[PDB]
Amino acid sequence: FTPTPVSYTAGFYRIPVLGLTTRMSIYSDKSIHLSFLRTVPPYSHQSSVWFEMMRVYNWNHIILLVSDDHEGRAAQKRLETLLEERESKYDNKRGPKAEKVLQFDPGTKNVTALLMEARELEARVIILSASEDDAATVYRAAAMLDMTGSGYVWLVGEREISGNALRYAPDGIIGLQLINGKNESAHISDAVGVVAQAVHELLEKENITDPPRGCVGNTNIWKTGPLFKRVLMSSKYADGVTGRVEFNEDGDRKFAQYSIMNLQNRKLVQVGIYNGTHVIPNDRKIIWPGGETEKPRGYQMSTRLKIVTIHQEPFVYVKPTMSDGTCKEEFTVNGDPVKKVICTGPNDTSPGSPRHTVPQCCYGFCIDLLIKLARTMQFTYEVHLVADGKFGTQERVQNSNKKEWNGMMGELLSGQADMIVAPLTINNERAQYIEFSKPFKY
Amino acid sequence: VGSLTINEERSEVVDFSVPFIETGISVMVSRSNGTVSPSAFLEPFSACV
Amino acid sequence: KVFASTGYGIAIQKDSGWKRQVDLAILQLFGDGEMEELEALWLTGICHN
Amino acid sequence: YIFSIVTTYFPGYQDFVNKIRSTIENSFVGWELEEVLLLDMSLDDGDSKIQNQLKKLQSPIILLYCTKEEATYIFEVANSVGLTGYGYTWIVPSLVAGDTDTVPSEFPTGLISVSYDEWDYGLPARVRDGIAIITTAASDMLSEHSFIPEPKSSCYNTHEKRIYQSNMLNRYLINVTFEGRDLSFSEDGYQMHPKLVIILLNKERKWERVGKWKDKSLQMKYYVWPRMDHLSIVTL
Amino acid sequence: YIFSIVTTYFPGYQDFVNKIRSTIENSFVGWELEEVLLLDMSLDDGDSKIQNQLKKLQSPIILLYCTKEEATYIFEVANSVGLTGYGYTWIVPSLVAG
Ligand SMILES: *[C@@H]1O[C@H](CO)[C@@H](O[C@H]2O[C@H](CO)[C@@H](O)[C@H](O)[C@H]2NC(C)=O)[C@H](O)[C@H]1NC(C)=O
Ligand SMILES: *[C@@H]1O[C@H](CO)[C@@H](O)[C@H](O)[C@H]1NC(C)=O
Ligand SMILES: *[C@@H]1O[C@H](CO)[C@@H](O)[C@H](O)[C@H]1NC(C)=O
């Protein structure tokens, strides 16, 4: 907050000021500060360069780890907002969408509960925007819990390519960097050129008649502060240390230029030159982590599944195991072998009572349908019953106007389950939350 | 629209909404004019009497 | 007790942007109890058995 | 019931509209929603080019969110579309209801808003309430911890020696209530159970009151809403 | 199927609307009709009432009867309400038609 104590003062009377070094996003809002005019694009915007990477790497599935504060808040806001393009009347190209955006807590020394529930997802790219304390635990976690395996693709912001992070930096990570970086001097010339271009335009109106000086007595917003600020932020020149220094819709340095660096296991090395859409890799070889060199497809479609199903006499019977860890065979009227699959039912004893997640081999009719499908589409599965014990409906919890899902439908839309096969109806209301097959018995 | 079935060869190119009226290969039968029992003349009394 | 469990439906061009909407709306039609009235208007007659 | 919403990029709007949506999908009542729009303060021709699609949206209820100036301008564009007849209302929050005695001729009638006025908030009584809050919170802190901090030696020079514990004041200071009336606060920095008022821009080009609100209860005064072809019927 | 009709004070209109009425009510087809309007271009505050009562009509087909200047005026207003896009096909006789 080293720039604040002056952003307020001349903010009173609304005297415009110019920002040089800091790059946090808080100072951008038009409601908390009427004073900043930013020469260095703040860390927020650098999200889009990743979206830009997506147009030449196609890893449409994607994981995000926003660290929870206003800093990361804006990062999530912006990245989420990027996807809203492609009205689709082109004609329906595959649109990259964010997967489970696992949020965070800044001051935390154990993240193990986050990575396995992350590693067991469907994607293979990691975009971590964070701070310097954060990369420490992030790396010291991922590099040891069997996370940095090959096929993993990483990205970070400008604040993770340095600090203690490098002193725990995993291989092949990728960073972002502006062409300038820090410069206590160069942008000064740029800014005074801005104010120059502003002055000789000020004569066009010059109805200000003063910016009120003196301490006491002149307690009135100078009636041309905002207008002169619009003027200043509307200053167009093209010759400083960077060309066409512009001011954004919110009034920030528009169209700066980046260049995608990279760590060579002990050495940062530039690869490309990022400029709006101008992002081209220079003379080098983009080496990817986990000991690999080909462009890795960020998707790994899984073959396992977890399927839940209900208890029902004509479709899915339930029988306890034997008395040693087995369960008993049986044949048909034609003596045909009927299948039986191991079933981890959490309901060894009835409701209104305890509940135990004992195995209890279960079979039926839809069981037969499932096994028929398995040999047809190269599957492998593990089955278990429903915790609650009813089809599943809508309701209102907290005895308030809330709305969610009970039963197996809820055990699925939780993200817990993965596929549902049982005698489940097909209504209208339950359609707007899920996709259904074709029908298989009227 | 109109009376149109659903199979694979048609599910290849065009796409199909969820069907509304059921259908399928069925049978048609006809009733029978009465079935007077063969052992009628010993029916209307129990074994006791 | 029928053989070829299929259903009449509606056919649209491949992967358009109306499959979803007509789907939701026709399931709505079932859920609100109207197709019974329609079948009563044309499909089934009076000669219930 | 609610219909289309228009706003213009002002800081603190996505929160608003997302609150609307998240509370309109989380209701057991037969709600609905129409085409939400988006505006721009940059230039003028596109405004009338898009602010009219909402008009064809037969939405008797429109929510706006801006400041008084672009508010006046968009209202002028509305009168340029007309929109002063019976049926079209507006519900706009306090951030446009300025000093509650200025009446630009642009504002059509019926323009309701929520405000929070001193007209029962009595400055002396509120001083009393505040002294109550602070002193009783210090009391509750004493009940927690049998010691109490000291005034800082300087507003600026104490910084070289500002070496003390970490104050968990808000962890309790948010939660204090006495004098019968409960004043549990919020963590994120505002009140809980705020007392609000509702104004209506009467055709008298003024506004004082219609009804009062408190603790999630609508104490009204107009059991049927007025007008600016409407019949009344009775049964047994 | 014919919907509302709008016009102004240009002479020779009563006979027009009387024709439309008499030939729409001596015909065994199920036509209809909606709010038949009348304007006053002679007032600038009428343009407000112009947009006002103009909004009150919703009609996939419209008839209008005036001369070229008033036509430009009314159409310039209507481009600001939305009577010109998809569907609202206008119909005018050959009086404008210079
Ligand atoms: C906030 O303060 C309230 C009291 O102001 C706490 O409430 C509980 O303890 C009080 C002690 O006398 C009781 O009077 C209240 O009845 C009791 N609450 C209920 C619902 O019974 C409350 O725990 C405090 N909470 C926090 C988070 O500080
Ligand atoms: C800042 O930019 C100027 C302009 O190119 C350059 O000469 C100077 O070396 C830069 N500052 C540093 C510390 O490199
Ligand atoms: C069945 O009985 C009806 C009674 O009138 C008679 O008309 C018909 O011919 C009979 N048919 C057969 C197959 O017995």
Side-chain angles (χ1 to χ4, degrees), chain A residues 2-29 31-51 53-54 56-84 88 95-99 101-118 120-121 123-183 185-196 198-200 202-203 207-212 214-222 224-228 231-232 234-235 237-243 245 247 251-252 255-265 268-273 275-281 286-291 293-296 298-323 325-347 349-354 356-381 383-389 391-395 397 399-402 404-410 412-442, chain B, chain C residues 2-49, chain D residues 1-3 5-34 36-43 45-48 50 52-54 59-67 69-85 87-105 107-116 119-146 148-151 153-155 157-158 163 166 168-170 172-176 180 182-190 192-202 205-211 213 215 217-222 224-226 228-236, chain E residues 1-40 42-43 46 48 50-54 57-98:
Chain A
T2 72
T4 79
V6 303
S7 88
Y8 285 157
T9 310
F12 207 86
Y13 317 103
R14 300 176 218 154
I15 309 98
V17 305
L18 295 200
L20 316 180
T21 305
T22 178
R23 317 188 48 201
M24 289 159 306
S25 183
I26 183 168
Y27 301 129
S28 44
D29 270 329
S31 277
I32 317 178
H33 300 251
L34 290 155
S35 41
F36 273 99
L37 267 192
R38 193 176 263 287
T39 57
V40 48
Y43 305 138
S44 80
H45 307 271
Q46 88 194 289
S47 87
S48 315
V49 159
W50 298 315
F51 175 85
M53 297 278 286
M54 293 305 104
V56 290
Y57 291 94
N58 310 63
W59 315 307
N60 299 352
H61 315 324
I62 184 169
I63 285 185
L64 158 64
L65 260 69
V66 171
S67 317
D68 167 33
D69 193 80
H70 179 264
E71 158 70 10
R73 195 65 38 189
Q76 199 196 334
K77 298 305 169 191
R78 172 156 273 148
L79 169 61
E80 287 157 318
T81 50
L82 315 173
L83 317 172
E84 297 166 349
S88 65
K97 44 185 46 174
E99 269 287 353
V101 291
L102 182 135
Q103 313 301 277
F104 193 43
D105 194 325
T108 299
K109 330 291 284 193
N110 51 3
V111 309
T112 47
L114 312 177
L115 275 81
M116 273 179 306
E117 66 165 336
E120 305 294 332
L121 283 179
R124 277 310 178 283
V125 301
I126 284 179
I127 293 178
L128 160 64
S129 178
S131 316
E132 282 62 13
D133 166 34
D134 322 334
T137 177
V138 163
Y139 301 155
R140 304 170 308 111
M144 67 171 178
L145 267 74
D146 314 345
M147 324 296 307
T148 173
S150 307
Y152 268 66
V153 170
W154 304 72
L155 301 172
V156 307
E158 212 162 8
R159 262 178 280 103
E160 303 77 350
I161 59 171
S162 76
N164 298 323
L166 300 191
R167 317 167 151 189
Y168 299 98
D171 74 331
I173 75 177
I174 314 297
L176 301 190
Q177 262 288 346
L178 191 84
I179 54 167
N180 301 332
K182 192 195 77 52
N183 194 294
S185 60
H187 316 79
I188 306 186
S189 45
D190 316 337
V192 288
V194 188
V195 77
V199 164
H200 275 314
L202 289 166
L203 287 83
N207 292 117
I208 51 153
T209 75
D210 183 40
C215 198
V216 57
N218 54 6
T219 306
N220 264 335
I221 39 173
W222 162 30
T224 42
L227 311 166
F228 159 84
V231 190
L232 192 91
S234 315
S235 176
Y237 80 107
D239 38 358
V241 77
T242 75
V245 178
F247 276 77
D252 269 12
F255 265 119
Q257 286 176 326
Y258 301 104
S259 159
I260 320 167
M261 316 320 188
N262 164 31
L263 158 68
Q264 198 44 55
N265 183 24
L268 277 181
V269 46
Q270 65 182 357
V271 176
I273 179 167
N275 166 34
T277 176
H278 288 242
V279 179
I280 301 300
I286 295 183
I287 299 185
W288 319 81
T293 173
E294 74 282 42
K295 164 186 178 178
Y299 192 34
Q300 196 33 65
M301 203 187 302
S302 315
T303 59
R304 301 295 175 89
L305 284 172
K306 202 157 300 191
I307 290 173
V308 67
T309 283
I310 45 184
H311 155 280
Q312 197 79 354
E313 293 170 13
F315 277 164
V316 168
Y317 305 83
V318 179
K319 299 290 191 178
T321 176
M322 289 310 283
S323 316
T326 62
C327 72
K328 140 199 189 171
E329 309 295 279
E330 187 39 58
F331 300 145
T332 60
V333 192
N334 284 106
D336 309 333
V338 291
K339 278 71 51 187
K340 271 228 164 184
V341 299
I342 294 315
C343 208
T344 80
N347 44 1
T349 48
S350 164
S353 304
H356 325 287
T357 71
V358 303
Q360 172 170 14
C361 78
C362 70
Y363 81 103
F365 160 63
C366 295
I367 306 305
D368 205 310
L369 181 48
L370 181 145
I371 289 174
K372 151 74 190 190
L373 282 191
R375 300 178 328 173
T376 320
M377 283 185 287
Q378 317 278 309
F379 290 164
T380 292
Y381 40 80
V383 183
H384 71 254
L385 304 187
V386 163
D388 161 85
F391 283 166
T393 42
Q394 265 195 357
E395 75 293 324
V397 312
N399 284 137
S400 168
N401 214 1
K402 283 281 307 180
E404 52 94 9
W405 300 92
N406 278 24
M408 51 177 166
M409 172 50 84
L412 172 60
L413 281 174
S414 54
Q416 166 50 245
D418 305 317
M419 167 176 280
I420 189 173
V421 291
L424 165 64
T425 48
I426 299 196
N427 60 71
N428 162 31
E429 69 180 1
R430 197 183 277 122
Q432 267 148 357
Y433 293 64
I434 204 175
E435 163 70 34
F436 271 167
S437 58
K438 298 268 193 180
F440 74 114
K441 159 179 302 306
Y442 308 129
Chain B
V1 301
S3 294
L4 185 58
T5 54
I6 276 175
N7 58 58
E8 180 274 341
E9 307 89 354
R10 303 175 184 171
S11 179
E12 161 170 88
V13 188
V14 288
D15 213 354
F16 286 104
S17 42
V18 163
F20 39 100
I21 290 178
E22 317 293 11
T23 178
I25 293 173
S26 162
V27 289
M28 260 301 300
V29 311
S30 313
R31 305 193 145 99
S32 277
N33 267 21
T35 70
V36 49
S37 163
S39 277
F41 76 94
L42 294 171
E43 297 169 328
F45 269 90
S46 66
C48 283
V49 283
Chain C
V2 199
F3 192 24
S5 41
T6 313
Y8 292 1
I10 324 164
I12 54 184
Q13 309 176 349
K14 184 141 162 285
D15 278 328
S16 165
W18 310 65
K19 206 191 94 167
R20 180 73 190 176
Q21 297 164 113
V22 297
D23 181 304
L24 263 298
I26 199 65
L27 260 166
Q28 150 83 10
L29 258 187
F30 273 169
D32 201 1
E34 288 72 17
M35 290 290 181
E36 277 70 0
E37 182 199 274
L38 279 83
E39 280 149 316
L41 197 152
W42 318 73
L43 192 62
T44 178
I46 177 184
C47 189
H48 66 105
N49 58 343
Chain D
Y1 300 90
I2 177 180
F3 286 115
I5 294 93
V6 75
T7 189
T8 166
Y9 283 166
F10 195 82
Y13 80 93
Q14 322 91 334
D15 51 0
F16 172 80
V17 55
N18 262 321
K19 180 59 182 187
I20 313 304
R21 271 168 179 161
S22 43
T23 200
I24 202 171
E25 63 83 14
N26 185 87
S27 158
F28 216 62
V29 175
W31 279 104
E32 86 281 3
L33 176 56
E34 269 292 336
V36 61
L37 273 175
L38 175 56
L39 295 197
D40 288 318
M41 81 161 287
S42 278
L43 274 303
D45 201 26
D47 315 342
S48 177
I50 315 186
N52 81 97
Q53 176 188 19
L54 185 150
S59 279
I61 292 90
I62 305 167
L63 310 193
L64 193 146
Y65 187 83
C66 175
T67 179
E69 292 64 10
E70 286 79 1
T72 46
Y73 175 67
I74 299 307
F75 277 139
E76 302 297 356
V77 191
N79 281 343
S80 85
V81 178
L83 191 142
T84 177
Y88 272 169
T89 57
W90 297 86
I91 305 298
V92 56
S94 156
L95 197 138
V96 297
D99 49 355
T100 63
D101 54 357
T102 68
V103 194
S105 48
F107 298 168
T109 84
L111 267 48
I112 313 182
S113 159
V114 173
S115 161
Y116 167 39
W119 305 324
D120 295 311
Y121 175 89
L123 306 89
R126 308 305 179 157
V127 178
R128 211 195 70 164
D129 311 330
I131 302 308
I133 284 298
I134 179 171
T135 46
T136 195
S139 76
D140 213 13
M141 158 75 166
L142 172 57
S143 69
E144 158 64 31
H145 176 61
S146 295
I148 177 80
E150 299 82 6
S153 66
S154 175
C155 63
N157 297 315
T158 301
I163 299 188
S166 88
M168 62 301 289
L169 274 187
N170 44 5
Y172 276 105
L173 295 209
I174 290 161
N175 189 347
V176 77
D182 157 76
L183 275 194
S184 176
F185 259 97
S186 300
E187 155 62 28
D188 45 8
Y190 39 75
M192 291 202 171
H193 314 268
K195 167 180 182 170
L196 279 303
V197 310
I198 298 94
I199 68 169
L200 156 65
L201 182 44
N202 182 280
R205 323 299 285 201
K206 318 160 313 169
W207 48 59
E208 307 310 320
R209 286 171 199 82
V210 292
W213 187 75
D215 64 288
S217 87
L218 272 300
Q219 322 209 359
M220 324 306 299
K221 209 187 61 173
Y222 268 66
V224 191
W225 186 263
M228 183 266 303
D229 298 339
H230 184 308
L231 316 161
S232 54
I233 55 175
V234 292
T235 62
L236 300 97
Chain E
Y1 288 150
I2 176 62
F3 301 129
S4 273
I5 290 90
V6 293
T7 183
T8 181
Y9 280 151
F10 181 86
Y13 60 93
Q14 301 84 327
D15 37 1
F16 178 77
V17 285
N18 289 312
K19 180 78 161 194
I20 205 180
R21 290 274 175 77
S22 159
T23 71
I24 203 169
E25 310 294 80
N26 185 50
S27 294
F28 204 53
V29 175
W31 305 75
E32 65 289 331
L33 206 65
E34 281 65 40
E35 299 211 319
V36 165
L37 267 51
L38 195 144
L39 308 183
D40 46 347
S42 317
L43 201 46
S48 61
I50 280 168
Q51 278 166 340
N52 203 27
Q53 191 59 46
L54 180 146
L57 74 97
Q58 177 268 337
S59 316
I61 293 92
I62 301 186
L63 295 192
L64 198 147
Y65 178 84
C66 81
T67 86
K68 201 178 294 273
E69 316 96 2
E70 310 77 353
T72 59
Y73 183 79
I74 302 309
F75 276 94
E76 207 166 1
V77 168
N79 205 358
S80 50
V81 59
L83 297 170
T84 75
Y86 193 88
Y88 296 179
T89 323
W90 289 75
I91 304 294
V92 180
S94 171
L95 277 187
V96 282

